[PDB]
Amino acid sequence: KFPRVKNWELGSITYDTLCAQSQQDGPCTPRRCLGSLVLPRKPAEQLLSQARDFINQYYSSIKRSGSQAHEERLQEVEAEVASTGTYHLRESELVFGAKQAWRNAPRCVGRIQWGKLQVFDARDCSSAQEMFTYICNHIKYATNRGNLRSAITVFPQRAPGRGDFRIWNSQLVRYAGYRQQDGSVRGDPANVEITELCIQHGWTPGNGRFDVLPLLLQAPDEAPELFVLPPELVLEVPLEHPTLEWFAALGLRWYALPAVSNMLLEIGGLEFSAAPFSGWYMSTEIGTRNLCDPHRYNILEDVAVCMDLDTRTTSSLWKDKAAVEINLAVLHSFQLAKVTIVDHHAATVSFMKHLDNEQKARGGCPADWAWIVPPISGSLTPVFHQEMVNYILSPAFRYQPDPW
Amino acid sequence: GPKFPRVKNWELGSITYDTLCAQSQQDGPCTPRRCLGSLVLPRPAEQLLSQARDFINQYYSSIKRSGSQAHEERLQEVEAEVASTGTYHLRESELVFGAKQAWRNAPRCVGRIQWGKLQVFDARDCSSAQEMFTYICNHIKYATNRGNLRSAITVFPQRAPGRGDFRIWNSQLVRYAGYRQQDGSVRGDPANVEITELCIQHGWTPGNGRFDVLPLLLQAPDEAPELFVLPPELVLEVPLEHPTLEWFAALGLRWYALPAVSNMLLEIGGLEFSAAPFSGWYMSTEIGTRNLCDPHRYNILEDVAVCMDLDTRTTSSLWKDKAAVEINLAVLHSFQLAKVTIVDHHAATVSFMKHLDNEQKARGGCPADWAWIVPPISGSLTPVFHQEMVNYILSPAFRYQPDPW
Numbered sequence: 121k122f123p124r125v126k127n128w129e130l131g132s133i134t135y136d137t138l139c140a141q142s143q144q145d146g147p148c149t150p151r152r153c154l155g156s157l158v159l160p161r162k163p164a165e166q167l168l169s170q171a172r173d174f175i176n177q178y179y180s181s182i183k184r185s186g187s188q189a190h191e192e193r194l195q196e197v198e199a200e201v202a203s204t205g206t207y208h209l210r211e212s213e214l215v216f217g218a219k220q221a222w223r224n225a226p227r228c229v230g231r232i233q234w235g236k237l238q239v240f241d242a243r244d245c246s247s248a249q250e251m252f253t254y255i256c257n258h259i260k261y262a263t264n265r266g267n268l269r270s271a272i273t274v275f276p277q278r279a280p281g282r283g284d285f286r287i288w289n290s291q292l293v294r295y296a297g298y299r300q301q302d303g304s305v306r307g308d309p310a311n312v313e314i315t316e317l318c319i320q321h322g323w324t325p326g327n328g329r330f331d332v333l334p335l336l337l338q339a340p341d342e343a344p345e346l347f348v349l350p351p352e353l354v355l356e357v358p359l360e361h362p363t364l365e366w367f368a369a370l371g372l373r374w375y376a377l378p379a380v381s382n383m384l385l386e387i388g389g390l391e392f393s394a395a396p397f398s399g400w401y402m403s404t405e406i407g408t409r410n411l412c413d414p415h416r417y418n419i420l421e422d423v424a425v426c427m428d429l430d431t432r433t434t435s436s437l438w439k440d441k442a443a444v445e446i447n448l449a450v451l452h453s454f455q456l457a458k459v460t461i462v463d464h465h466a467a468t469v470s471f472m473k474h475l476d477n478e479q480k481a482r483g484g485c486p487a488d489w490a491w492i493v494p495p496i497s498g499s500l501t502p503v504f505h506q507e508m509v510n511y512i513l514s515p516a517f518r519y520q521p522d523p524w
Numbered sequence: 525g526p527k528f529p530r531v532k533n534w535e536l537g538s539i540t541y542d543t544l545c546a547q548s549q550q551d552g553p554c555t556p557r558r559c560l561g562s563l564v565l566p567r568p569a570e571q572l573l574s575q576a577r578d579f580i581n582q583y584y585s586s587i588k589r590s591g592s593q594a595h596e597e598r599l600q601e602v603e604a605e606v607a608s609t610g611t612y613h614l615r616e617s618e619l620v621f622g623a624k625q626a627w628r629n630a631p632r633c634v635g636r637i638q639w640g641k642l643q644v645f646d647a648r649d650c651s652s653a654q655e656m657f658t659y660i661c662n663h664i665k666y667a668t669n670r671g672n673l674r675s676a677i678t679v680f681p682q683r684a685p686g687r688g689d690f691r692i693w694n695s696q697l698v699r700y701a702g703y704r705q706q707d708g709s710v711r712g713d714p715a716n717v718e719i720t721e722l723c724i725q726h727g728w729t730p731g732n733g734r735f736d737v738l739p740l741l742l743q744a745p746d747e748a749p750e751l752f753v754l755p756p757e758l759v760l761e762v763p764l765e766h767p768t769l770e771w772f773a774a775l776g777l778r779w780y781a782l783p784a785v786s787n788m789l790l791e792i793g794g795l796e797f798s799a800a801p802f803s804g805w806y807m808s809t810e811i812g813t814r815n816l817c818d819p820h821r822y823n824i825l826e827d828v829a830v831c832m833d834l835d836t837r838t839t840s841s842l843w844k845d846k847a848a849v850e851i852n853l854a855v856l857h858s859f860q861l862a863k864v865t866i867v868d869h870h871a872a873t874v875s876f877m878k879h880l881d882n883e884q885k886a887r888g889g890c891p892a893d894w895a896w897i898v899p900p901i902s903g904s905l906t907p908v909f910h911q912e913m914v915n916y917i918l919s920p921a922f923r924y925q926p927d928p929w
């Protein structure tokens with residue numbers, strides 16, 4: 121049965137027929153739904169059918185479905201897998217696969233942009249030093265002085281014989297988190313472990329709240345190497361508020377570039393264990409999650425006290441009021457610094473447009489409602505009222521085990 | 525590790541495993557192929573006996589008499605009743621247990637810390653629409669308790685072979701009329717357009733205000749539904765004002781005190797109670813965010829933002845967020861002033877986290893629908909946003925049922 125998908129605000133219904141193209145199981149079963157879980161719990165013919173399916177997707181996308189080029193490409197893949205157990209993508213196929221992985225990413229609210237992705241082929245990378253150069257170019261390109269551009273850099277794929285290329289950091293730009301044996305964390309508590317790893321591999325730590333981490337880059341079967349990002353590469357935006365002057369005094373800042381660097385890109389059965397990608401932020405990621413999460417910088421209380429709100433009682437809605445102001449400060453500060461950012465209303469509106477384009481284009485769109493609805497003001501955005509079907513299509517971005 | 529769903533709280537870093545899902549006898553809408561967790565409504569003979577046996581086992585476990593002579597006698601008494609009549613009947617204490625358990629089992633209810641404190645009115649002797657009305661009036665008076673709200677359910681006779689059902693036609697005991705206007709817009713609550721027009725068709729003289737309390741359409745078996753007007757002093761409402769924005773009172777907004785769901789089917793041991801209205805107290809975001817701010821409900825966000833002089837021409841001013849917060853504060857403040865029970869979403873979710881811990885120990889899990897439990901504003905400011913949840917159907921249960929018309 122294809123799911124009927126209703127928008128409860130508008131009363132419109134669609135049917136998702138794209139989900140029939142899914143070949144991998146998600147975590148749910150008829151007995152229990154595990155849709156709110158963040159992470160999953162856990163042969164040549166199998167590779168060949170994913171390869172062929174991907175090759176088919178590619179030629180169908182260039183309208184050449186059945187051309188001489190198509191049949192001879194399938195024959196190449198076949199021959200290469202039969203001989204070697206693996207195969208290699210053409211650059212054009214890689215580009216198409218990377219865009220498709222993004223298009224297919226159920227957790228991404230920014231998929232309206234899926235077609236505009238700069239793909240850097242870094243599969244000719246042979247050392248951690250080279251990965252660093254490619255990463256530097258990526259940041260430079262993606263950052264573009266604040267006029268951010270979506271980009272992905274694709275490092276060599278996994279091979280049966282060897283260790284993976286990996287970037288140990290979960291993002292290219294992350295702030296350190298220094299633990300104190302009196303429990304507390306200075307900086308970003310989300311990055312305590314990668315901070316410790318960096319120090320342990322010989323990084324000299326700072327002691328600030330916003331110390332940019334170096335990269336730990338690992339070439340196959342080698343100790344990772346440490347590479348400090350040149351300060352000039354890392355665009356940061358100090359946070360101010362358009363009307364509250366004390367807000368500046370908070371000393372808050374955030375980096376411009378959200379660049380995920382720990383996910384696996386799977387295309388046609390091939391796996392790219394290092395393929396960092398970046399777009400631009402949606403303000404709530406910074407304002408709400410990174411700054412207000414209790415296990416992140418956790419600044420709600422501080423902002424609320426400065427706003428002189430009654431903090432002694434939840435029913436004064438001090439948290440909500442402070443959150444709004446902090447999100448406002450992020451938007452304003454990014455706008456002032458001329459750095460691309462999207463607010464959650466604009467982003468979700470674009471996502472609804474994306475759902476509509478995809479319905480027409482493919483008969484569905486995999487979407488993870490818990491991730492698409494923003495972390496504040498949920499029902500004030502259109503996506504809250506929109507039913508969504510979540511499923512895994514390939515090419516995909518997948519989580520993978522931490523390399524240590 | 526353990527062969528059950530692993531459930532993580534990402535704020536605290538703690539893990540639990542849900543073993544309760546093993547008790548689920550009924551498939552939800554998801555498959556390994558695709559998750560439908562976000563859909564609002566996804567699509568007997570020996571069957572009854574098997575559900576009845578299971579329910580009787582639950583009752584006897586809960587009174588710690590499982591395996592006992594009284595337990596085996598009850599089982600036999602149910603089999604005999606079914607064998608000769610096709611149906612059976614619940615003892616009063618079984619109904620009370622079953623109603624509380626249906627609440628406890630309700631995955632979309634964030635208010636379940638209260639599940640043990642539910643007043644069960646047994647209205648299974650009801651035999652006319654007039655009497656349903658008296659019972660409902662009684663329920664409302666009891667539950668409202670002049671603003672000190674008390675959870676209650678009234679259970680009308682179960683569905684029975686051949687004979688028609690008891691149905692309350694209204695989706696809640698208190699609802700505001702929604703009047704379709706000439707221009708196509710709605711005065712009042714757009715949610716209630718259909719029930720409003722049915723009330724008119726069945727002889728109600730409509731008002732034309734934004735907050736007209738609807739009459740009840742009560743259906744006794746095999747009879748046309750009958751119309752009953754709630755005496756006004758029975759329906760407690762709260763005019764809305766804001767603690768600092770003095771003009772907010774001038775908007776003339778109000779909401780009623782008692783959220784009383786009246787169109788769900790209570791299913792206990794295979795028996796089906798098609799009329800079993802239940803009521804708690806509000807969580808403030810239900811009023812302030814959903815009922816007042818949903819674009820397809822009262823849709824007041826823009827009016828309020830304009831009074832607050834916000835910049836409504838750009839999303840990036842966050843005018844919607846600022847106005848929603850102030851509306852939610854007005855709801856909390858106004859109910860507080862009026863001394864009508866209400867719980868804010870921070871307090872509700874904190875208590876639901878406690879509920880989860882309790883149920884982890886009591887039963888090894890708790891079915892929870894994340895999308896419904898996480899409040900509609902400020903979601904990640906609440907502890908439930910960071911809590912993974914496993915959603916599954918247990919019985920006894922409250923279930924949606926089709927409209928009687």
Ligand code: HEM
Nearest residue numbers: 222225227228229230233270271397398399400401402517
């Ligand atoms: C262009 C601007 C973009 C915006 C505004 C955006 C928005 C978002 C947001 C808000 C999330 C949730 C992030 C979180 O909660 O931590 C996300 C997740 C994601 N997006 Fe994007 N996106 C953008 C570009 C991209 C690009 C270029 C890719 C890859 C090519 C991508 C793939 C993903 C993936 C794979 C996830 C899930 C990450 C995870 O599971 O941790 N997005 N997106």
Ligand code: HEM
Nearest residue numbers: 627630632633634635638675676802803804805806807922
């Ligand atoms: C005691 C105070 C209570 C609070 C604060 C509360 C809270 C809530 C909230 C916020 C919802 C979501 C409603 C929506 O989005 O429309 C809900 C749903 C629900 N609650 Fe409660 N609850 C309470 C008492 C009760 C009682 C007494 C029962 C039944 C005995 C109940 C059973 C339900 C059910 C079945 C739903 C799902 C309704 C649906 O799907 O439409 N709860 N609860």
Ligand SMILES: Cc1cc(N)nc(CCc2cncc([C@@H](CN)Cc3cc(C)cc(N)n3)c2)c1
Nearest residue numbers: 159290378379380382397398399400401402405
């Ligand atoms: C490309 C892009 C654009 C944009 N606007 N935002 C992003 C952010 C992606 C992201 C960054 N850190 C963390 C996450 C988290 C959950 N918030 C997902 C996650 C979970 C776990 C267990 C590990 C991990 N590395 N990542 C996601 C990426």
Ligand SMILES: Cc1cc(N)nc(CCc2cncc([C@@H](CN)Cc3cc(C)cc(N)n3)c2)c1
Nearest residue numbers: 695783784785787788802803804805806807810
């Ligand atoms: C007992 C109780 C306490 C409390 N605080 N709140 C409630 C509210 C219940 C409720 C009130 N209106 C509407 C709903 C809607 C979805 N928001 C659920 C729903 C959807 C549909 C399609 C049908 C139906 N009967 N019910 C649920 C009930």
Ligand SMILES: C[C@H](O)[C@H](O)[C@H]1CNc2nc(N)[nH]c(=O)c2N1
Nearest residue numbers: 156157158490491909910911912
């Ligand atoms: C437990 C829950 O799934 C988890 O907190 C999710 C909820 N929704 C999210 N949505 C986004 N965009 N990012 C997140 O990290 C999360 N976290």
Ligand SMILES: C[C@H](O)[C@H](O)[C@H]1CNc2nc(N)[nH]c(=O)c2N1
Nearest residue numbers: 504505506507562563564895896
């Ligand atoms: C599409 C989506 O399931 C729908 O809008 C849900 C989301 N979460 C909800 N949560 C609650 N508590 N109540 C609701 O009516 C809804 N609506």
Ligand SMILES: [Zn+2]
Nearest residue numbers: 148153554559
């Ligand atoms: Zn699911």
